[model samples]
Target: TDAVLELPAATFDLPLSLSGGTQTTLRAHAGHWLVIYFYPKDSTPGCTTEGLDFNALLPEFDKAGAKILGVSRDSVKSHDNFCAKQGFAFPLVSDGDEALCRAFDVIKEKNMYGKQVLGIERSTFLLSPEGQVVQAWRKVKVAGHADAVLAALKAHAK
Candidate 1:
């Protein structure tokens, strides 16, 4: 069913606002390309690498008429620190209660080091200007990932 996976047509509420006090809605990305990436935790090595990689590619993404947003089950404070420390030019949404994660179907149970725990499976969803999900990458690996996404976006452009 992975091939048939579809992003939910739901909107998530955040406590913070972007630029202005104007609220943003997930479905309202009707004419703007968007990349929504979900990660497990912040400030960790792998997470930092992923974040920095994406940060470095902001100009390229902007040139493609797109905006990128990262999500995690961490708090806004945590995200603020992570973004400030890494010079990330994007906003990180706090999916603290996992409501958004559950809506996106990324929150799941997994086994790690012989221990069972519930967490988000690293994932990314690339959405077209009209809000339709064009592509998705689950259990994403950090290495060479930003390039892969750029390639995907370039391919999608044609």
Candidate 2:
């Protein structure tokens, strides 16, 4: 067996839902391109910057027939607060148990300032309209990353 396995299409289900009554599972099969990004925490520096970038580009993503969903192990309450405080227009799903993170293999052993920690490895997955993973950005650097993803989506549409 391969140590690393590709995520199955149906393994994208999680009972946890996001604000605005959007179910994470249904969003996968919503007949539109999807960008599911996994972050370590909500309201943190890196996460905040990335969230703002995504928020600023919300219209571009919509114009590209894609919807962005940010994921983190934080609770739904935290997500709710983050969105409101940051004025983010998109949905942020709470992966409180790391179920979706593990399914996407985004969870990892991290080291920050010499302390070993377990957290999400800043990743993004691009799913086609049919829910198949078309592209993945693992260990993502927050700067200029959304533009890269948008470029990939634009390229894939051809």
Candidate 3:
């Protein structure tokens, strides 16, 4: 497993399919602090809660000048359904190509149901307006995580 540390200073771009049939790049959101979260799947229990939590805090994040994004290997069709079902205000990206996943190094080996598995290790990255990573969270716990991120943004991004 890779060590969970602040990402090295860098400018990164991702071609992502967003909810509502829109596509965008990381560089497109250059002026605002960026919150990029990676989850394992769409519509699962933990993922659902995390998405809802972040969705609930969207206004506050926007007020703090941060743009939020959720990503998973799920397809665009799946993301569209999930976004509709959850009523999330922020867009969720369908990382079907896993380019973002590989770039962020969120994929990891794990033991699931007593069997070895390879999957996304729930992670989050806070990027400065210049596209440099300001903070990072790996193996994130769903409960209260969005609040923690919000607090961090208020402290550092503002």
Q: Which candidate achieves the best lDDT against the true structure?
A: 3
lDDT of 2 at 123: 96
Residues 1-158, candidate 2: write the lDDT tens digits: 31123675557555656855556683445688888888888999999999999899989888987888899988778888899999999998887778788888887886778998877899998877866677889999999998898888888766
Every model's TM-score = 0.85, 0.87, 0.89
Q: Arrange candidates by TM-score, highest first: which order?
A: 3, 2, 1
Would you give me the overall lDDT of model 1?
A: 0.77
Task: Give the residue spans of candidate 3 off by over 4 A.
Answer: 1-11, 111-116
What TM-score would you give candidate 1 relative to the actual structure? 0.85
Best by TM-score: 3
TM-score of 2: 0.87
Residue 9's lDDT in candidate 2: 53
Q: How far in Å is the alpha carbon of 113 misplaced in model 2? A: 9.4
Please, what are the lDDT tens digits per residue for candidate 3 over residues 40-122?
99999999999999999999998987899999999989999999999988898888887788788898987888999988999
Q: Which window of 10 residues has the lowest lDDT sum in candidate 1? A: 12-21
Worst 10 residues of 3 by lDDT: 2-11
lDDT tens string, model 1, 58-156? 898888888888888887778778878888888887777876677778988868789888889989887788666778898999899887887788777
Clashing pairs in 2: none
Query: Local distance difference test, per candidate?
Result: 0.77, 0.82, 0.86
The residue pairs found clashing in candidate 1 are none
